[PDB]
Structures are given as structure tokens and as C-alpha cells.
Scaffold this active site. Structure first.
Site, PDB file in Angstrom:
ATOM      1  N   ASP B 110      40.585  33.371  40.838  1.00 37.88           N
ATOM      2  CA  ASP B 110      41.756  33.836  40.204  1.00 37.88           C
ATOM      3  C   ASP B 110      41.651  34.747  38.928  1.00 37.88           C
ATOM      4  OD1 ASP B 110      40.939  31.802  38.290  1.00 37.88           O
ATOM      5  OD2 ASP B 110      41.976  30.450  39.604  1.00 37.88           O
ATOM      6  N   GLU B 197      29.782  25.430  29.957  1.00 39.98           N
ATOM      7  CA  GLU B 197      28.959  26.461  29.938  1.00 39.98           C
ATOM      8  C   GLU B 197      27.827  26.252  29.029  1.00 39.98           C
ATOM      9  OE1 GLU B 197      33.130  27.749  30.999  1.00 39.98           O
ATOM     10  OE2 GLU B 197      32.249  26.447  29.529  1.00 39.98           O
TER      11      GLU B 197
END
Lengths: 241, 247
Positions: B110, B197
Site C-alpha cells: 500500500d 525494524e
């Protein structure tokens, strides 16, 4: 003799603008013989839009008109219609097709191949409009449009979204006074205000396998959360997004 | 020309085909790109299989189901198992000393990606980083670089002092590094918001080895755009449109 597709894209300045124009440009770069008519709702052409168009290499025309104190993009699409009429002669020779494509919808490449042969006005299903998975023109076994498969006002002259049809440029030039109505016009009736003046239901050309396939989607982009910017701002205002 | 392995976790929902379609339209322009699409599903779905085949792109279609239990709540970031599946697949497909020039990028279906972005990450030697728009409650988050050309911190409001204050879409990893650090995966459970992350990157490199991209981190080449849920209220309880029609 490949017809030119004039993609009319009204746009306006807001956070996600550059992103929308970027992924749209990435789609359009695949389309041959394309002319991108971008019309900004602003008092003047913005450098953000000017630079993006410049850097794509695409054949574009950059216009602008500010909407005063009516559906969004109306005056912009109308300015594009006037430009087309002032640029191409009524009985011109260079074949073309006109498509009103907002900067936030999602377009498949097959959609453009389908609308390129439009003789008068072509139509197809559009996903995520009218509170449905998709709206679609009703086509009989003979291949003629006889109605509209929608829930919201299914009886309007043309119950179809802006992204669901294309018009041969010839019709736009011939019907030189036909524009989108912004005056007293019921909701979802603006498309009809123009189409009614250009074509009749039985002359519509159904695309997408007799309107059984979805080749375009009415995607909406969420407003980004910028709460951490604060009242003074955190990021550099000169860095373009 | 190094191959870019774009890892894209995805799952079935109304806007899926549209997302994959416009993402494909962008990726089609990128040379030497390998799209590693990983579906959150027990089997490859016909929708995705068909779409990938028709794009003409070089791709590998994988799948692993995120347990229903993991998606419930009375945490586990979406796509985690799918991204990890891709990492495992790369390690099982390429020999540790493959030396095969490649870069790995975790790109959600997206976000919005510019073509320039891919050429910026293609030359990654270890781990590269760049600014990302619409993340951390800001117009954008950007790594902070010193005069020596090294990343020395992160321009963010939310926990800027974490190991790597950057979004999934803001970095790429040299394939060799991924193959060498064979045990490095994204943290599955108990992932503190905004720290996944770091959970992977900390096992792969140090701040000093990061390679700042996008004009020394002064330009935005990728946007964390989010698509709104379509309103389907007019479908009713019985459904108005044909469920066989693929959207």
C-alpha cells in the site's frame, strides 16, 4: 492512427498529493499516445506539480483554476473541456478520446486499451463507488446498455462514476456548450449533466467484456497523521513531500 | 546491475487487487527486479496467482498463514511471518557465499514508491537508509547524517534514540549480508511499537555502516500512504453485487 487519450486530471494541494501523482504517473508512463491534462485547483500553477510533470517526460498540459467559496474538481474538469475546444477544431482530424481521471483512483493498463477505440461514449464497471463492491452498467445479450446496476438512484440518466466512461473527442468538440453542471444539481447527477447532452443510452459502448470485469478502482487515501509536527513544526518545511 | 528482491507481504481484503495492480504498474518499470510476494494464506490464492502471471514481472509467489490466534486480541505486527518466510526462502535458495549481486527491500503493498528509489537502493553494500513520508506522526522521518557521510541519528519525534528509528520502507539490505547473518529475523511476539525494524537491523549492522541515500537523506522518494476501507453498506446482508466478480 492510434487515437490519443487525453487524461483529464483535476488535482489540489494536500499532503498526499505528490504521492498520488507519482503512482499515477508510473501507471500512465506505460500508455502510448497519451496526453495528460492536469488542472490544479489553485490560484496559480504550483512548482511541485510543474516539476513532477516536467520530470516524467510525459506529454502534458498544466492548467489551473481556483474554486471560489459543488463536486470537487468540477471547475477544473470544465476548464479542461474549454481548453480542448479552444485547442482542437470541431471537424478536426487528429482522433482522440477524453477520460476524466481523478488523481487518487487506481487504473489498470487494460482500462486504457479498452477506451482507446471509443467511437462515441464507452462505459465500464467501477469498483468501490455507490456504497458497493462496484457499480456496473446493465448490458443485454445484444451488447447494448439498457440500465445501471446500482443501489443509489439507479434511475438517473447515467448512474455511473466519473471514472467509468470515456468520450470520443469529436463529441466534446461538436457539443461545444456542454459542461459539467455545478449549479442546482442533485448528488450523483453531475456525470448525467454532461453525458445527457452528448449521448443516448443505446449508443453507449460497453467495455470490460460487456461490463463483467473491474478494470478501475475508486481507491481513497487516508489523511496522514501529522500530530507530532506540533504547532511550530518539526520537519523542514522546505523539504517537499 | 544488481537484482532487487522486493519482499511484499499481502493478504486478502477488498482493496488488495487494486493495491497490487498499481504497485505492479510501478515495479514494471524497474529492471532486474524480482518480486517476492508472500501471501498470508494457507494456499496461493487464484486472485494473486493470476495477477502476478499477467503482469509479466519476474516473481516468486510464496505463502504462509498467520495463525488466526495471532491476529486476535482480547504484539504481532502484520506481515511479520510473511517477511520472515521470505528471508528464510532467500537463505534456502542462495548459497551463503553466493556472491550473487542482490539487495533486499521489504515493501508493503500500500505504500507509494518512486522509480528513483530503486536506483538509490540498488547499489547497497551493507544497509542503506532514506527518508520516508507519513510515518511517526510526521510529514516524514529522515536519518541524520554527519559531515563524514555517516548516519549519526534519526530526525524523528517518536523514540529517536532507538537503535534504528526508521520505517520498514526506509531501508534495504545487501543480500550477501542477509545470507551471512542466517539467524537474523524480525521479532515475532512482544514487539514494542516501532521497534521491529531495529530487531532485525541490530543483528545485521551498526550505525556506522549505514549508507545514506536520497541526496544524503534530504529527499522523499517513498511515501507511507494508507488506503481507506471501502464503504460497502449498500451491499446489504444478502449482498447486491455478484461475489464471483473479482475486484
Amino acid at each position: 492512427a492510434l487515437p490519443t487519450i487525453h487524461v483529464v486530471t483535476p488535482t489540489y494541494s494536500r499532503p498526499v498529493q505528490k504521492a498520488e501523482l507519482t503512482r499515477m504517473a508510473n501507471t500512465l508512463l506505460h500508455v502510448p499516445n497519451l496526453h495528460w491534462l492536469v488542472v490544479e485547483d489553485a490560484p496559480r500553477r504550483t512548482p511541485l506539480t510543474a516539476r513532477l510533470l516536467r520530470d516524467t517526460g510525459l506529454n502534458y498540459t498544466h492548467l489551473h483554476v481556483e474554486t471560489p467559496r459543488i463536486p470537487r474538481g468540477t471547475m477544473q474538469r470544465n476548464l479542461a473541456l474549454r481548453w480542448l475546444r479552444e485547442t482542437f477544431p470541431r471537424n478536426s482530424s487528429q482522433p482522440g478520446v477524453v477520460y476524466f481521471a481523478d488523481d487518487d483512483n487506481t487504473y489498470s493498463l487494460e482500462l486504457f486499451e479498452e477506451m482507446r477505440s471509443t467511437r462515441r461514449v464507452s462505459v465500464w464497471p467501477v469498483a468501490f463507488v455507490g456504497g458497493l463492491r462496484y457499480e456496473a452498467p446493465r448490458v443485454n445479450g445484444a451488447g447494448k446498455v439498457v440500465r445501471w446496476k446500482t443501489v443509489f438512484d439507479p434511475h438517473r440518466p447515467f448512474a455511473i462514476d466519473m471514472a467509468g466512461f470515456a468520450v470520443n473527442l469529436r463529441l466534446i468538440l461538436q457539443r461545444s456548450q456542454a459542461y459539467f453542471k455545478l449549479r442546482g444539481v442533485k448528488g450523483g447527477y453531475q456525470e448525467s449533466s454532461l453525458l445527457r447532452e452528448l449521448v443516448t443510452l443505446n449508443d453507449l459502448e460497453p467495455k470490460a467484456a460487456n461490463c463483467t470485469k473491474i478494470l478501475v478502482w475508486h481507491t481513497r487515501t487516508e489523511k496522514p497523521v501529522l500530530v507530532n509536527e506540533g504547532k511550530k513544526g518539526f520537519t523542514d518545511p522546505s523539504v517537499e513531500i
